[PDB]
């Protein structure tokens, strides 16, 4: 079992002895601090609240375990056993805290309060920041969802430009990051964040997380298609790549099938094997079950353009209404190597210049999509901004002399829509002046209970492109 | 409950129908493929084997669940229900696979076989690569441990050079990555990997994982000390930073205490607050309970150097036997911002140039230590190199025309020590020629059972610096 009492940065175990005496309230907030990523998708807190913070998270056994663990870790007994016993006794192990947040899936400009946390019992003033570690990890789903959405924008722009519509956009970027992430839990969280924007993933763990913590009416929230890997092709022997291809497309003749074709010579595979030897098995396929050729090495853009050139010389090519070339409906390409937000842009731009519709190619991304992202990309930060000591409110904040960018907000915060339709975070409790509309944050957690939640369908709707 | 049948890349579910017919064996291997990081620490496989692959991992319930999930995911019933039921019925849910690996903690040059996987039942030829995804995630602890060890080398070099010994080397790089990683599980795995080289971490989960999956006779495998954060300092109010400091150092007067000092002005804090107003509370501390000043903003090197300059002007400084300046024993510094393998080198080099012993400063790293790393950093790859089809062995491999660096090894592999004391991976079963010593890989998993385990003490011993 997971023990929340051990799920915090070690030093926080000693903070209850560091706050000013007589502090009855500690109020903190999370934001994606201001500076390419002007707006962020707020997604993931609901997962964390439901999996780690709700219900009876404190037990006599967990308190004892934590006590022994930290005693050795610090080689001193500094663990706040009393404080946790109080929560166990008074609230049946339910956390005396209130969390307010903008709706899951919301697209909010940088520099705005996304969620706030405060203790609901004066005795638990120390709890607000104790749970910072667990809650700040929300940076990951937020960042994956945001970076994913930004790639969707790129694809939407070029697809619209070269085809005149956005049909199939939600299937243009597939999640191939399962093996490329740091753990099983991470694979699930990341895949679910990607699914906020797209439907393609090879990590079903993401689908399970979605149905368990969010819920969806969508019959197919996440999908994938049969696909070969280097092992299934190379296993046939180098001289029998053609036999591997033929066997695979024949086995999956009525469904779309992706076939990695760069095991030995991607260009020879496209021109001679697919384009000549087995061409008769491709042109006979249905628009519903195309062959998706998959290069997986070399310069991403150059390889895609050369593959398209080869395929265009071997298969009938049409020109859509926008004047861009389109491969026959039974043949497509997927580039799943070296694809990240930067190269994605380069590839579609190159395709556009060569007059190829973006309809022809879909993409896949792994580590770049779910692993090579940090809390610094969007400056995800959790900071205390208000406390009550001696019954007096105090607006707190940090403002490092050498880095003005790390200045944090002061006092009680609230977010509002402006008259022009934008967002603004009011500080120092100025939201009380009521010069703006209602605070956009809602209480989502209070005293061990999730008080407001969202289906994944609402999350996706909230995260839609404009 | 974790379901291994769902813990693989979606497309692998369709691979049992893609291998050449009459294939009774699929043999694959993991390596940190060649073309910094010339050697890797092999660590983490034991965790994965014990947590996810050992014992009865298949059940009627899990098979049915996977069956339903994949049906919706693929909108077709391609799931190999028959193959899994076979494992359930024949081996009581134990995986018919044999895994051989170099000892945990081993420091191996790039381009060598680190572990191999093969099915032990001809009917399970498809199982070898089914588990690639879960096993390949070993890239993370390997990479963290490797990058962490490379930072230890930098620290050892400069500590040795500026002080003449390696005293306290294992405490020079602290893991502050809990909030900066993608998940709770990742936090624990990463912290464990870091602990292969160092002892400091603020993620006790790493300690638990070590004791549960490796075991240690070490009384204190991982440690931390009391420390303040911006919230506990700023909560006192901007005009009372001194009161915060005074309160914290007195509360922790008998143990080492870290105090973040850049909330408003790191330089004013060091020179006027610590260096004057509260100097009397610092110079009175023991060598076992020093004040550890923590800057946390601005250029990492410039800030450390200016802080040292300031402290040197307010506190007694000695010159060690190597001619480097040393702060008094009751005063130290920790730079836990912007520290990565590259800036770490820059900081210690800058310190050495200014004649400050590395004994004066310790470091902390978060996302750079446990998050901003990818599978391609060491090119961690899993590939099929041998299969038996129609009773005949076939040496398998990939070799992309546009990228020779992606060429994989052929046939049965083994690793041996060379006469010069180096490492060599023999391919095509040449290890059988016996021109080299014994195979360095040992069977660690076979038919559902972990057959060879290493204590964390062995792991640490194996990963020590030369």
- Closest by CA position to B102, among listed B445, B434, B397, B441: B441
Alpha-carbon gap: A183 to the closest alpha carbon of chain B (Å): 5
Tokens matching residue B390:
């129609």
Q: Is B398 helix (H, G, I), strand (E, B) or coil?
A: coil
Distance, first Cα to last Cα, chain A: 43
Q: Hey, are the CB atoms on A18 and B232 less than 8 Å from each other?
A: yes
Tokens matching residue A143:
């960042």
- Closest by CA position to A131, among listed A106, A99, A101: A99
Q: Hey, are the CB atoms on B402 and A182 less than 8 Å from each other?
A: no
Alpha-carbon gap: B395 to the closest alpha carbon of chain A (Å): 8
Q: Hey, are the CB atoms on A232 and B367 less than 8 Å from each other?
A: no
Tokens matching residue A290:
């195309």
Q: At what angle do helices A60-74 and A81-91 cross, to 10 degrees?
A: 170
- Closest by CA position to B139, among listed B34, B43, B28, B39: B43
Number of other CB atoms surrounding residue A288 within 10 Å: 10
Distance CA B137, CA A380 (A): 26
Residue B120 CA, distance from chain mean position: 31
Using CA coordinates, name the residue in chain A closest to B397.
A234
The answer to whether B214 touches B196, Cβ cutoff 8 Å, is no
Work out whether the CA dihedral B5, B11, B12, B13 comes out positive or negative: positive
Distance CA A275, CA A261 (A): 12
CATH 3.20.20.70-classified regions of chain A: 137-374+454-466
Q: Hey, are the CB atoms on B69 and A398 less than 8 Å from each other?
A: no
Helix (H) or strand (E) holding B72: helix B60-74
Residue B450: partners with Cβ closer than 8 Å, 6 or more residues away: B46, B49, B50, B54, B444
How many Cβ pairs within 8 Å bridge chains A and B? 345
The answer to whether the annotation marks A332 as part of a ligand binding site is no
**Deposited experimental method:** X-ray
Instruction: Among A26, A33, A184, A239, pick the best mutation site for testing chain B contact (most B Cβ within 10 A).
Output: A184
Distance CA A118, CA A126 (A): 10
Chain B residues in contact with A11 (beta carbon < 8 A): 202, 224-229, 258
Give whole-number Cα distances, B88 to A453, B62, B444, in Å: 39, 10, 22
Return the residue matching tokens 């992309």: B400
The answer to whether B177 touches B365, Cβ cutoff 8 Å, is yes
Residue A454: partners with Cβ closer than 8 Å, 6 or more residues away: A46, A103, A104, A105, A214, A462
Of B20, B75, B224, the CB nearest to A236: B20
Residue A391: partners with Cβ closer than 8 Å, 6 or more residues away: A22, A24
Helix (H) or strand (E) holding B99: strand B97-101
Q: Is B285 helix (H, G, I), strand (E, B) or coil?
A: coil
Q: What angle do CA A64, A65, A67 make, to 5 degrees?
A: 65
Q: Hey, are the CB atoms on B232 and A190 less than 8 Å from each other?
A: no
Q: What angle do CA B210, B215, B219 make, to 5 degrees?
A: 90
Q: Hey, are the CB atoms on B231 and A384 less than 8 Å from each other?
A: yes
Distance CA A42, CA B323 (A): 54
Distance CA A203, CA A223 (A): 9
> How does DSSP classify residue B371?
T
Chain A residues in contact with B190 (beta carbon < 8 A): 182
A210 backbone dihedrals φ, ψ, rounded to 5°? -60, -50
Q: Hey, are the CB atoms on A382 and B8 less than 8 Å from each other?
A: no
Distance CA A169, CA A153 (A): 10
Burial of A318 (C-beta count, 10 Å sphere; 0-12/13-18/19+): exposed
Long-range contacts: A60-68, Cβ < 8 Å, 24+?
A60/A88, A62/A1, A62/A3, A62/A4, A62/A5, A63/A5, A63/A88, A65/A3, A65/A5, A65/A6, A66/A3, A66/A5, A66/A6
Return the residue matching tokens 């697919």: A274
Counting Cα atoms < 13 Å in the Cβ hemisphere of B11 gives 27
Q: Hey, are the CB atoms on A264 and B403 less than 8 Å from each other?
A: no
Using CA coordinates, name the residue in chain B closest to A177.
B9
B404 backbone dihedrals φ, ψ, rounded to 5°? -60, -20
Give bridge partners of residue A383 from the DSSP assignment: A29
Counting Cα atoms < 13 Å in the Cβ hemisphere of B33 gives 18
Q: Hey, are the CB atoms on B203 and A28 less than 8 Å from each other?
A: no
Beta strands in A154-302 (DSSP E): 173-175, 257-260, 291-294
Tokens matching residue A265:
């010579």
Resolution in A, one decimal?
A: 2.0
Q: Please state whether beta strands A331-335 and A325-326 pair in parallel, antiparallel, or not at all (unpaired).
A: unpaired
Work out whether the CA dihedral B304, B309, B312, B318 comes out positive or negative: positive
Chain B residues in contact with A125 (beta carbon < 8 A): none
- Closest by CA position to A293, among listed A343, A240, A330, A345: A330
The answer to whether B251 touches A18, Cβ cutoff 8 Å, is yes
The answer to whether the annotation marks A367 as part of a ligand binding site is yes
Number of other CB atoms surrounding residue B132 within 10 Å: 24
Alpha-carbon gap: A19 to the closest alpha carbon of chain B (Å): 5
- Closest by CA position to B66, among listed B55, B56, B77: B77
Alpha-carbon gap: A242 to the closest alpha carbon of chain B (Å): 12
Q: Hey, are the CB atoms on B235 and A384 less than 8 Å from each other?
A: yes
Of B26, B297, B396, the CB nearest to A400: B297
Distance, first Cα to last Cα, chain B: 43
Number of other CB atoms surrounding residue B272 within 10 Å: 16
Of B18, B268, B401, the CB nearest to A265: B401
Instruction: Among B402, B404, B406, B410, pick the best mutation site for testing chain A contact (most A Cβ within 10 A).
Output: B402
Tokens matching residue B207:
């300690």
Residue A82: partners with Cβ closer than 8 Å, 6 or more residues away: none
Chain A residues in contact with B222 (beta carbon < 8 A): 73
Architecture of the domain whose range is B137-374+454-466: Alpha-Beta Barrel (3.20)
Q: Hey, are the CB atoms on B18 and A228 less than 8 Å from each other?
A: yes
Residue B46 CA, distance from chain mean position: 13
Using CA coordinates, name the residue in chain A closest to B243.
A20
Distance CA B97, CA B133 (A): 15
Number of other CB atoms surrounding residue B207 within 10 Å: 27
Q: Please state whether beta strands B423-426 and A97-101 pair in parallel, antiparallel, or not at all (unpaired).
A: unpaired
Q: Hey, are the CB atoms on B186 and A185 less than 8 Å from each other?
A: yes
Q: What angle do CA A268, A269, A273 make, to 5 degrees?
A: 105
Distance CA A29, CA A132 (A): 9
Of B6, B17, B230, the CB nearest to A251: B17
Distance CA B109, CA B106 (A): 10
Tokens matching residue A316:
């009938």
Alpha-carbon gap: A72 to the closest alpha carbon of chain B (Å): 7
Distance CA B317, CA A87 (A): 48
A320 backbone dihedrals φ, ψ, rounded to 5°? -75, 180
The answer to whether B34 touches B110, Cβ cutoff 8 Å, is yes
The answer to whether B42 touches B100, Cβ cutoff 8 Å, is no
The answer to whether B14 touches A249, Cβ cutoff 8 Å, is no
Distance CA A195, CA A460 (A): 8
User: Helix %, strand %, coil % for chain A, to 5?
Assistant: 40, 20, 40
Chain B residues in contact with A228 (beta carbon < 8 A): 11, 15, 18
Alpha-carbon gap: B418 to the closest alpha carbon of chain A (Å): 30
Chain B residues in contact with A306 (beta carbon < 8 A): none
Q: Hey, are the CB atoms on A137 and B226 less than 8 Å from each other?
A: no
- Closest by CA position to B361, among listed B323, B311, B298, B288: B311
Chain A residues in contact with B74 (beta carbon < 8 A): 223-226, 255
Q: Hey, are the CB atoms on A267 and B17 less than 8 Å from each other?
A: no
Q: At what angle do helices B341-353 and B300-314 cross, to 10 degrees?
A: 40
Chain A residues in contact with B138 (beta carbon < 8 A): none
Tokens matching residue B112:
């060598």
Of A9, A19, A367, the CB nearest to B232: A19
Number of other CB atoms surrounding residue B450 within 10 Å: 17
Q: What is the dihedral of CA B412, A296, B146, B305, to 10 degrees?
A: 160
Number of other CB atoms surrounding residue A269 within 10 Å: 27
Q: Hey, are the CB atoms on B298 and A7 less than 8 Å from each other?
A: no
Distance CA B136, CA B48 (A): 10
A34 backbone dihedrals φ, ψ, rounded to 5°? -65, 150
Helix (H) or strand (E) holding B184: helix B184-194
> How does DSSP classify residue A372?
S
């Amino acid at each position: 079992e997971f023990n929340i009492l051990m799920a915090t940065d070690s030093y926080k175990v000693t903070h209850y002895k560091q706050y000013p005496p007589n502090t009855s309230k500690v109020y903190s907030y999370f934001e994606c601090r201001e500076k390419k990523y002007e707006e962020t998708v707020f997604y993931g807190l609901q997962y964390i609240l439901n999996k780690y913070l709700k219900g009876k998270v404190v037990t006599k056994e967990k308190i004892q375990e934590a006590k022994e663990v930290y005693r050795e870790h610090f080689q001193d007994d500094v663990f706040n056993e009393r404080g946790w016993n109080y929560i166990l006794e008074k609230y049946d192990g339910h956390l005396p805290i209130e969390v307010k947040a903008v709706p899951e899936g919301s697209v909010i400009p940088r520099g705005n309060v996304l969620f706030t946390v405060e203790n609901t019992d004066p005795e638990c003033y120390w709890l607000t920041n104790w749970i910072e570690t667990i809650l700040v990890q929300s940076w990951y789903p937020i960042t994956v969802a945001t970076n994913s959405r930004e790639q969707k924008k790129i694809l939407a722009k070029y697809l619209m430009e070269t085809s005149g519509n956005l049909d199939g956009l939600e299937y243009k970027l597939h999640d191939f990051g399962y093996r490329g992430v740091s753990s099983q839990e991470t694979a699930g969280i990341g895949a679910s964040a990607h699914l906020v924007n797209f439907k393609g993933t090879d990590t079903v763990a993401g689908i399970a997380l979605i149905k368990k913590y969010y819920g969806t009416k969508d019959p197919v929230p996440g999908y994938s298609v049969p696909a070969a890997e280097h092992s299934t092709i190379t296993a046939w022997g180098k001289d029998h790549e053609k036999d591997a291809f033929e066997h695979i497309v024949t086995q999956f003749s009525s469904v779309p099938v992706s076939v990695v074709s760069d095991s030995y010579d991607i260009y020879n595979a496209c021109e001679k094997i697919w384009g000549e030897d087995l061409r008769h098995l491709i042109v006979s396929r249905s628009t519903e079950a195309p062959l998706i050729i998959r290069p997986d090495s070399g310069n991403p853009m150059d390889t895609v353009l050369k593959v398209l050139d080869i395929l265009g010389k071997k298969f009938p090519v049409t020109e859509n209404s926008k004047g861009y070339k389109l491969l026959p409906p039974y043949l497509r390409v997927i580039q799943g190597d070296g694809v990240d937000i930067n190269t994605l842009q380069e590839i579609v731009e190159g395709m556009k210049q060569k007059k190829w519709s973006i309809e022809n190619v879909s993409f896949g991304s792994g580590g770049a999509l779910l692993q090579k992202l940090t809390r610094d990309l969007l400056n995800c930060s959790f900071k205390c901004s208000y406390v009550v000591t001696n019954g007096l409110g105090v607006n707190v904040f940090k403002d490092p002399v050498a880095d003005p960018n790390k200045r944090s907000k002061k006092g009680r915060l609230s977010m509002h829509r402006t008259p022009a339709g934008n967002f603004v975070t009011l500080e120092e409790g100025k939201g009380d002046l009521e010069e703006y509309g209602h605070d956009l944050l809602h209480t989502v957690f209070k005293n061990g209970k999730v008080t407001k939640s969202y289906s994944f369908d609402e999350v996706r709707k909230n995260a839609q492109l404009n």
